[PDB]
Each structure stands twice: as C-alpha cells, then as structure tokens.
Design an enzyme around this catalytic site. Structure first.
Site, PDB file in Angstrom:
ATOM      1  N   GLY A  38       2.022  -0.803   5.774  1.00  0.00           N
ATOM      2  CA  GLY A  38       2.599   0.519   5.212  1.00  0.00           C
ATOM      3  C   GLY A  38       2.433   1.507   6.600  1.00  0.00           C
ATOM      4  O   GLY A  38       1.862   0.960   7.418  1.00  0.00           O
ATOM      5  N   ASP A 152       7.165   6.014  -7.796  1.00  0.00           N
ATOM      6  CA  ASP A 152       7.682   5.075  -6.733  1.00  0.00           C
ATOM      7  C   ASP A 152       7.911   3.688  -7.503  1.00  0.00           C
ATOM      8  O   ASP A 152       7.479   2.732  -6.793  1.00  0.00           O
ATOM      9  CB  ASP A 152       6.486   4.979  -5.659  1.00  0.00           C
ATOM     10  CG  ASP A 152       6.968   4.374  -4.207  1.00  0.00           C
ATOM     11  OD1 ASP A 152       8.054   4.433  -4.196  1.00  0.00           O
ATOM     12  OD2 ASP A 152       6.122   3.798  -3.719  1.00  0.00           O
ATOM     13  N   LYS A 154       9.809   0.384  -7.886  1.00  0.00           N
ATOM     14  CA  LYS A 154      10.676  -0.275  -7.001  1.00  0.00           C
ATOM     15  C   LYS A 154       9.941  -1.746  -7.144  1.00  0.00           C
ATOM     16  O   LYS A 154       8.995  -2.087  -7.502  1.00  0.00           O
ATOM     17  CB  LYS A 154      10.918  -0.063  -5.639  1.00  0.00           C
ATOM     18  CG  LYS A 154       9.392   0.145  -5.037  1.00  0.00           C
ATOM     19  CD  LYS A 154       9.926   0.699  -3.681  1.00  0.00           C
ATOM     20  CE  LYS A 154       8.540   1.071  -2.849  1.00  0.00           C
ATOM     21  NZ  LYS A 154       8.568   1.664  -1.395  1.00  0.00           N
ATOM     22  N   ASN A 157       6.795  -2.779  -5.445  1.00  0.00           N
ATOM     23  CA  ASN A 157       5.607  -2.151  -6.234  1.00  0.00           C
ATOM     24  C   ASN A 157       5.091  -3.039  -7.210  1.00  0.00           C
ATOM     25  O   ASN A 157       3.980  -2.665  -7.977  1.00  0.00           O
ATOM     26  CB  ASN A 157       5.630  -0.680  -6.370  1.00  0.00           C
ATOM     27  CG  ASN A 157       5.612   0.174  -5.029  1.00  0.00           C
ATOM     28  OD1 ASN A 157       5.235  -0.427  -3.889  1.00  0.00           O
ATOM     29  ND2 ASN A 157       5.962   1.231  -5.204  1.00  0.00           N
ATOM     30  N   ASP A 170       0.468   0.570  -6.294  1.00  0.00           N
ATOM     31  CA  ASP A 170       0.787   1.581  -5.642  1.00  0.00           C
ATOM     32  C   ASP A 170       0.994   3.014  -6.447  1.00  0.00           C
ATOM     33  O   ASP A 170       2.139   3.256  -6.723  1.00  0.00           O
ATOM     34  CB  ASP A 170       1.955   1.433  -4.734  1.00  0.00           C
ATOM     35  CG  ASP A 170       2.232   2.215  -3.454  1.00  0.00           C
ATOM     36  OD1 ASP A 170       1.468   3.361  -3.345  1.00  0.00           O
ATOM     37  OD2 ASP A 170       3.249   2.168  -2.456  1.00  0.00           O
ATOM     38  N   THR A 187      11.549   6.407  -2.909  1.00  0.00           N
ATOM     39  CA  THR A 187      12.307   5.498  -1.826  1.00  0.00           C
ATOM     40  C   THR A 187      13.732   5.831  -2.292  1.00  0.00           C
ATOM     41  O   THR A 187      14.366   6.150  -3.460  1.00  0.00           O
ATOM     42  CB  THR A 187      12.211   3.916  -2.429  1.00  0.00           C
ATOM     43  OG1 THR A 187      10.595   3.611  -2.224  1.00  0.00           O
ATOM     44  CG2 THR A 187      12.818   3.041  -1.378  1.00  0.00           C
TER      45      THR A 187
HETATM   46  C1  LIG Z   1      -1.357  -8.583  -4.104  1.00  0.00           C
HETATM   47  C2  LIG Z   1      -2.045  -7.503  -4.860  1.00  0.00           C
HETATM   48  N1  LIG Z   1      -3.018  -7.758  -5.579  1.00  0.00           N
HETATM   49  N2  LIG Z   1      -3.147  -6.405  -5.969  1.00  0.00           N
HETATM   50  C3  LIG Z   1      -2.682  -5.392  -5.298  1.00  0.00           C
HETATM   51  C4  LIG Z   1      -2.702  -3.930  -5.197  1.00  0.00           C
HETATM   52  C5  LIG Z   1      -2.066  -3.220  -4.446  1.00  0.00           C
HETATM   53  C6  LIG Z   1      -1.278  -3.992  -3.420  1.00  0.00           C
HETATM   54  C7  LIG Z   1      -1.066  -5.335  -3.262  1.00  0.00           C
HETATM   55  C8  LIG Z   1      -1.874  -6.042  -4.408  1.00  0.00           C
END
Ligand SMILES: Cc1[nH]nc2ccccc12
Lengths: 336, 20
Positions: A38, A152, A154, A157, A170, A187
């Site tokens: 990010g 957010d 999408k 996420n 997210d 987005t």
């Molecule tokens: C792959 C994965 N597991 N848990 C998460 C939390 C936020 C972003 C990615 C994540």
C-alpha cells in the site's frame, strides 16, 4: 436481530471507550512473506514464535501516514478493528508500534483475495455472488448499527477463508459517525455519487458500494470503468447503468435500487433499512441465519498445501524493515 | 464486448484507494 445487535453494541462500546494497546512486540514474530502492499506500508505473513500461529501483519510507516495526512484515519482503523466482533470481519490479534512503524497483527486468511479469484475465473455465478453478497449485507448491518461507516468495499479487500467464507479486511477508511461526513475517500469504481459531488454523505454510500460489488462479481467487470478516474466519475454520476444479458431480472432490479443516485430511493437507506435488501427477490433463497452461522455450503473452497502456504497470493518485492534509532511522530500516534 | 473493453483497460489490476 434487534436484540443480537443491542448486545453486540454493548460489547463494542466497552472496547471502543477503552481500546487495547501495545499487546505485542516486533521481535515476537518471524517475518515470512509480503502478501500485499500500500501507499504507507505492507501486509506480511508472519509466524508468532510463542504459539507457532501464523498471522497477517500490517506495517504502516508513521512518516508516510503523516505525509499522506492519514493520521486520524489510521487511528480510526485500529480503534475500530480492536473493538468489533463479527464472523466476517478479520480479527485483530495484536497491535503495537515502535520508533518507525505501526503494527496490526490479524488472523491470516489463506484463501487469497476475492479479487484474484474473480479476475482469474472471469465472473461468479449468481448463486456464488449471492453467497458473498449475503455476508457483506450482514456485515454492513452489523457495522452500521454500531454507527460505523466502512467506505472501502472492493474485491481487493475481501479475503476467502478455508471454509470459503469472506473476511473483510482494511478498515483504513472506517469511521464512527452519527451524523454526515465529508471525506473524499474510497476507490474510484466504488464511490457513490454523493462522495464524488463533494456533499455530505452517510452509510448509504456503503450500500451503493454493495451494488458495485454484486455487479462486478456477477459480470466480471464493474458497472463504471474507464482508464482515468475522472471518466469513471462522469459515468457514476450520470445515472446510467447497463447490465449484461445474462443478469437475471431479479438481479437487475436489486442493482437498480442499490445503484440509485437518488438517496431517498436507494435500498438500504429507506425507512425499512437493510430489510429492503434482505427481503428482495434476488435474496429469496438466502437463509440469513444459516449464512451468519456459517452452515451454508460454500460454492468455492480454496486449495491449500498446509499452514503458512501463500500460493493463493501474488508475489511482491521484499524490503527490509528498518526501525529508526529515533522516535518518529510520537505525539501523532500516542493513542495507537 | 464490454468484457473485451475491460480486459483491454488499465483498470483490471488492483485498484488503489484515493486520499485527500
Ligand atoms: C492475507 C490476510 N490475512 N489477514 C489479513 C488482514 C489484512 C490484510 C490481509 C490479510
């Protein structure tokens, strides 16, 4: 429902008013691989030494957060995440900070992003899309009852777990608001017209976003797309939406009410709230209680080679985590 | 087809959020 949400709110409020802080340290985790990146950080697969458990650790560069003016949004994210509890919301296990970064250690969701699967497969069948959509509907019902706006939604996420269920990740734009809010965030493809038109907006933007999600899952592409965001914004506010010929009449009707530019007519925002969505014909075969209890069979179960496997995620360039000798932005993130 | 137009667009990869 009403009674369940009331107790959920009591639980949330206790954590919201007295948030957990400094529950772990960087040295307690073994960094394995980058699962996503990010603007002000990355997410890495890590292994908690003491338990042998795998987690997803989100690392945020405090200096980058400040430069992008996302301090309040980042504080919102952690404060909200540590306080929520729903089967479709990723769990925040630990959170801490050091001289350079902020860290949020969450439950690892091995199946990968819905985005990856949607793009590869092309499009989801209506029953498949409906399955995921139902989970989002319940999650938004939960979040909104807590006066939380997500902002957010999408495929990028939404992670798929071992049981084929969704995990909302997210919370960078999540905010607890009782009135209207004005931040331009989200987005491009998923922004409601109110947001683009720079006016105050509310939870209704999440429901518009749901319409975009359902459309994209069922069609394989978003209802509004172009090469440049400005062109996307023009399409969104135009009030025109074209549906693929394979879309059922019920799906089209749901989408027309979800992707409604007129707030006084958008589903989810009427006097009956979420019930107008839950009781819609397209969701006739959906057993809401069963979805919440995870007893409905998933249309897709991701393949795994074992614990810590990352085959369902793309490869990202690795970068060393350097912790400065000096504390950066201490006052800005004191409550983290 | 819309599908062909989408696949040929520069927006099929991960979409970044917009701040400020
Ligand atoms: C792959 C994965 N597991 N848990 C998460 C939390 C936020 C972003 C990615 C994540």
């Amino acid at each position: 429902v009403k009674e369940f949400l009331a107790k959920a709110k009591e639980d949330f409020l206790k954590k919201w008013e007295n948030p957990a802080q400094n529950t772990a340290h960087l040295d307690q985790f073994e960094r394995i691989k980058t699962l996503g990146t990010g603007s002000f950080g990355r997410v890495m697969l890590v292994k908690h030494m003491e338990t042998g458990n795998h987690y997803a650790m989100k690392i945020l560069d405090k200096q980058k957060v400040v430069k992008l003016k996302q301090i309040e949004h980042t504080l919102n994210e952690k404060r909200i995440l540590q306080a929520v509890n729903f089967p479709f919301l990723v769990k925040l296990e630990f959170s801490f900070k050091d001289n350079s970064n902020l860290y949020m250690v969450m439950e690892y969701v091995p199946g990968g992003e819905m985005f990856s699967h949607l793009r590869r497969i092309g499009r989801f069948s209506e029953p498949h899309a409906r399955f995921y959509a139902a989970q989002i509907v319940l999650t938004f019902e939960y979040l909104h009852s807590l006066d939380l706006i997500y902002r957010d939604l999408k495929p990028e996420n939404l992670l798929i777990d071992q049981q084929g269920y969704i995990q909302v990740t997210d919370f960078g734009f999540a905010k607890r608001v009782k009135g209207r809010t004005w931040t331009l965030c989200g987005t491009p493809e998923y922004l409601a017209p109110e947001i683009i038109l720079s006016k105050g907006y509310n939870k209704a933007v999440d429901w518009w976003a749901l319409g975009v999600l359902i459309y994209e899952m069922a069609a394989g592409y978003p209802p509004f797309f172009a090469d440049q965001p400005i062109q996307i914004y023009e399409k969104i506010v135009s009030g025109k939406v074209r549906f693929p010929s394979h879309f059922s009449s019920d799906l089209k009707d749901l989408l027309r009410n979800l992707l409604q530019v007129d707030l006084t007519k958008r589903f989810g925002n009427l006097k009956d709230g979420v019930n107008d969505i839950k009781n819609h014909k397209w969701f006739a075969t959906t057993d809401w209680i069963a979805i919440y209890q995870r007893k409905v069979e998933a249309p897709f179960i991701p393949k795994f080679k074992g614990p810590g496997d990352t085959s369902n995620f793309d490869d990202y360039e690795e970068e060393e985590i350097r912790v400065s000798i000096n504390e950066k932005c201490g006052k800005e993130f004191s409550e983290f | 087809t819309t599908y062909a137009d989408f696949i040929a667009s520069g927006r099929t990869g991960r979409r970044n959020a917009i701040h400020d």
